[PDB]
């Protein structure tokens, strides 16, 4: 078959402002097939209240999804998105960066 690896971005819905509640996003897309496992992390532990968009596919047939959760940025708290697919051997943890 022709499988494809998730592209992954991790980001806030608005500009991080330390101490204002916001939403943490991890957008995964360009993958195939559709089974995927996505978590958001605070300091390397899973966050439980994570929701996502319904499944979709782009014109090139590949799939995209958004996962998200409410959070509050602080200067030193560390956030990340972990991801598993049949294209990956190890889960891909991408860290969240304010400036990006």
């Amino acid at each position: 078959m022709i499988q494809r690896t998730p592209k992954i971005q991790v980001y806030s819905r608005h500009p991080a402002e330390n101490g204002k509640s916001n939403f943490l996003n991890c957008y995964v897309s360009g993958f195939h097939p559709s089974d995927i496992e996505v978590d958001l992390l605070k300091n390397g532990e899973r966050i439980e209240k994570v929701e996502h968009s319904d499944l979709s596919f782009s014109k090139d047939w590949s799939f995209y999804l958004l996962y998200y959760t409410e959070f509050t940025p602080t200067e030193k708290d560390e956030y990340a998105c972990r991801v598993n697919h049949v294209t990956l051997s190890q889960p891909k943890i991408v860290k969240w960066d304010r400036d990006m």
Binding site: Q9, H14, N25, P33, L55, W61, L66, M100
Partner: protein
């Protein structure tokens, strides 16, 4: 230029010999309906507010087609397994794209009807809408049967008729602003990168639809080398974000300008970095 599309997916499960079947209909790239078999109670549903007014007789009709397709995908999914010689014991994916593009004269530009299996193009109806293009030694089998059975004529009908006509209804009753465009709100953050250097990052936010262009300039000369960027991303409220960045020597940031291009902008934006 307007357009309609129904994006269908079915994924075959091991054991529980119903595949999950999902269908989503777009009008001018906007999700307006959906059917998801895995849902507790399956039914095409409205997915933008302007669809609610279609009576009940529309949703039943629509919903029966779905259960129809579910089956065709159930069976086609088997058929394929035989062609490729794969295991009843592993998950397989088949998708379909169909619909019409209209031009701003509301004339029919093109109709599409193609399929993918396992993420690879399998068979597509050509622009003539009487013939097929087939990749695999296997998808030629599907081709012959289709040529023999007169498959094309059927799809041509849908394409040049219902898909045109209904896309108009959805586009007059969808007068109720499918017009929505939220313009970008842009700004330039500043991020010291190395000794003697900084990154300027132009952000476009709270925009819809998702097409947008970003560029950076140095005294009129667009930048192409040294432009980093990202793929456009959903903010999660229905709108999109993107940014683009360049690296720039300390103290010269004010004579680099960022331009943002989006429909629903009155003019193209121009901005530079400033606290």
């Amino acid at each position: 230029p307007h357009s309609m599309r129904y994006f269908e997916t079915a994924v075959s499960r091991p054991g529980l010999e119903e595949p999950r079947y999902i269908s989503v209909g777009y009008v001018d790239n906007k999700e307006f309906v959906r059917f998801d078999s895995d849902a507790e109670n399956p039914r095409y549903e409205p997915r933008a507010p302007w669809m609610e007014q279609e009576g009940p007789e529309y949703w039943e009709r629509e919903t029966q087609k779905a259960k129809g397709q579910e089956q065709w995908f159930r069976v086609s999914l088997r058929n394929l397994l035989g062609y490729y010689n794969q295991s009843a014991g592993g998950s397989h994916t088949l998708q379909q794209m169909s619909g019409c593009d209209l031009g701003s004269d509301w004339r029919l530009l093109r109709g599409y009807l193609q399929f993918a299996y396992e993420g690879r193009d399998y068979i597509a109806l050509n622009e003539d809408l009487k013939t097929w293009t087939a990749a695999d030694m296997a998808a030629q089998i599907t081709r012959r049967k289709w040529e023999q059975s007169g498959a094309a004529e059927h799809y041509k009908a849908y394409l040049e008729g219902e898909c045109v006509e209904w896309l108009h209804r959805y586009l007059k009753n969808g007068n109720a602003t499918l017009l929505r465009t939220d313009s970008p709100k842009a700004h330039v953050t500043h991020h010291p990168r190395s000794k003697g250097e900084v990154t300027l990052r132009c952000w476009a936010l709270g925009f819809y639809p998702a097409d947008i262009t970003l560029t950076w300039q140095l005294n009129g000369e667009e930048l192409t080398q040294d432009m980093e960027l990202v793929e456009t991303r959903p903010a999660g409220d229905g709108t999109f974000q993107k940014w683009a960045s360049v690296v720039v020597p300390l103290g010269k940031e004010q004579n680099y300008t960022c331009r943002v291009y989006h429909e629903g902008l009155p003019e193209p934006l121009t901005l530079r970095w400033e606290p």
